[PDB]
Design a protein around this ligand. Structure first.
Ligand SMILES: O=S([O-])[O-]
Ligand SMILES: O=S([O-])[O-]
Lengths: 196, 199
């Protein structure tokens, strides 16, 4: 049996298909998947409840072995009818927007705090939501702007109900990590399917 | 000064359109939205942390006033390659498929257990997932079968990545409840927001 805990982006937009490919080639092999945020994954790995954990924020703990797994780009997005789309986008223009952010303790919020909102002086924090679907649908209804992994809003980017905003910053690329406890099981068979 | 705590189905697929229309005609008034599961909302209203709660499961707590608000139709669904799609679907066939269900404390978990899972004897619980999106894509890739609100899987029901399964049972309709504390009856500004939540 394998126990995997993934953060929101991974557990909802990367992991389901991997399990499909895994349980296709290995039926009768158990897999219990749990999805929370990056903090919940880290604490669940520390408690010896899961075998491996997949996080989208950093993790600098002595008892945790973190290895880079995939790359992921966060994007500022807005509704197509947003005034931010017309004209040159600057830092001061982005700080003046109503930002809908993920709760503190999520990897998305921590990374965007480091790469983006760190340079938006006194950015207006309009709403804090505990999941990215509520953030996605709020932004597409013109309730503000946000920053999420491209995997979360991919379908809405192609459909058109959400438009990527050109940010005057280097691309907001982040690393998704695989973690496990140092002091801690057919994982090699499962880790095969997490390769590109 | 209005704070609303809603469950995952309501917060993700209903409230955004309402709040947008509300902030359009009333841009001044503040509006704080929080989304969790049904137990999150119930516990928050009991603790006076939020003015009103919107849930997708029953709530029978003593000092919580629950009133039906909307109706919501749950759907048994699977991938286009499931054996549940053809023949007469029976309860023994349904119980024999891998069921991906929500975590306990979700209104969806409690309602499908009462209206459906109670009638599938010895159903296999393949997985338990904390959110309906992971469920939606797990079944979309073929991991099994589940039951979610039609609002959650409407996009996929359209394109065909997910297919509705006919259940030999009455249509699985649930009631979305609006709750508040028996001690704190809702204010007048809160009432104006409720007009926008109605059909
Ligand atoms: O769920 S993640 O954004 O930590
Ligand atoms: O998240 S809901 O099912 O309470």
């Amino acid at each position: 049996a394998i126990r995997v805990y993934a953060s929101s982006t991974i557990g909802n937009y990367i992991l389901p298909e991997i399990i499909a490919r895994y349980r296709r080639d290995f039926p009768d092999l158990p897999l219990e998947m749990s999805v929370g945020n990056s903090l919940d994954v880290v604490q669940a790995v520390c408690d010896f409840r899961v075998d491996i954990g997949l996080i989208e924020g950093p993790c600098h703990m002595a008892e945790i072995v973190a290895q880079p797994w995939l790359e992921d780009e966060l994007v500022v997005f807005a509704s197509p009818a947003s005034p931010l789309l017309e004209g040159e986008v600057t830092l001061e223009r982005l700080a003046a927007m109503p930002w809908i952010l993920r709760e503190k303790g999520s990897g998305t919020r921590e990374i965007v705090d480091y790469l983006l909102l760190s340079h938006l002086p006194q950015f207006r924090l309009s709403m804090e939501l505990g999941n990215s679907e509520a953030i996605k649908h709020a932004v597409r209804h013109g309730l503000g702007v946000s920053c999420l992994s491209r995997r979360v809003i991919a379908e809405q980017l192609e459909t058109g109900s959400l438009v990527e905003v050109k940010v005057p910053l280097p691309p907001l690329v982040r690393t998704l990590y695989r973690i496990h406890h140092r002091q801690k099981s057919a994982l090699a068979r499962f880790l095969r399917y997490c390769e590109l």
